[PDB]
Amino acid sequence: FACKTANGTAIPIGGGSANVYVNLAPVVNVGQNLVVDLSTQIFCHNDYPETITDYVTLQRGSAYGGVLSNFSGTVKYSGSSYPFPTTSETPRVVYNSRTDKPWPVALYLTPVSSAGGVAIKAGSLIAVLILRQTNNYNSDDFQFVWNIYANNDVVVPT
Ligand SMILES: COc1ccc(C#CCO[C@H]2O[C@H](CO)[C@@H](O)[C@H](O)[C@@H]2O)cc1
Numbered sequence: 001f002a003c004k005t006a007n008g009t010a011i012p013i014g015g016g017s018a019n020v021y022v023n024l025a026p027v028v029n030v031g032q033n034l035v036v037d038l039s040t041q042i043f044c045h046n047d048y049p050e051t052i053t054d055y056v057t058l059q060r061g062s063a064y065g066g067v068l069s070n071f072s073g074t075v076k077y078s079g080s081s082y083p084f085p086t087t088s089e090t091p092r093v094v095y096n097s098r099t100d101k102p103w104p105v106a107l108y109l110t111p112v113s114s115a116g117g118v119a120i121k122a123g124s125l126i127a128v129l130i131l132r133q134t135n136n137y138n139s140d141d142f143q144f145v146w147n148i149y150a151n152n153d154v155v156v157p158t
Pocket residue numbers: 001002013014045046047048049051052053054134135140
């Protein structure tokens with residue numbers, strides 16, 4: 001089991017960490033969502049699907065910088081929605097193929113009432129998503145840490 005980004009960089013077998021940049025709508029109002037869909041960027045695969053089944057959860061989703069101070073959010077993981085920042089590890093998603101399959105995570109962020117002006121700075125860290133991978137074969141229990149960075153400024157109109 002390993003993952004890579006479209007970008008792309010990779011996190012190899014046994015886990016590790018990688019930085020991911022995302023494009024964000026440059027203007028968002030109170031009551032609207034920024035949607036940060038990571039499933040078009042992060043892809044994982046199972047290295048031995050004929051004998052091993054891999055299980056992948058979102059272990060934890062944390063907010064930083066302008067996202068932590070100026071937005072409230074939810075995360076959608078494999079068809080279900082949860083608060084973001086997260087309050088517990090999600091149910092698992094099965095990886096059973098050597099063919100890259102997207103990691104099905106998307107953040108929906110909406111500005112809080114105090115937001116105004118530049119609410120997210122270009123190049124700043126906005127979130128960390130931890131992918132946890134286990135299997136039905138041995139004791140492997142690995143973290144894939146995705147540090148999510150803003151590509152561009154996001155302004156909440158005043
Ligand atoms: C019984 O014969 C064997 C067949 C396959 C293997 C193996 C292996 C590779 O391990 C990696 O690939 C596995 C499957 O993606 C992961 O679940 C592991 O965590 C790990 O990333 C070991 C023994």
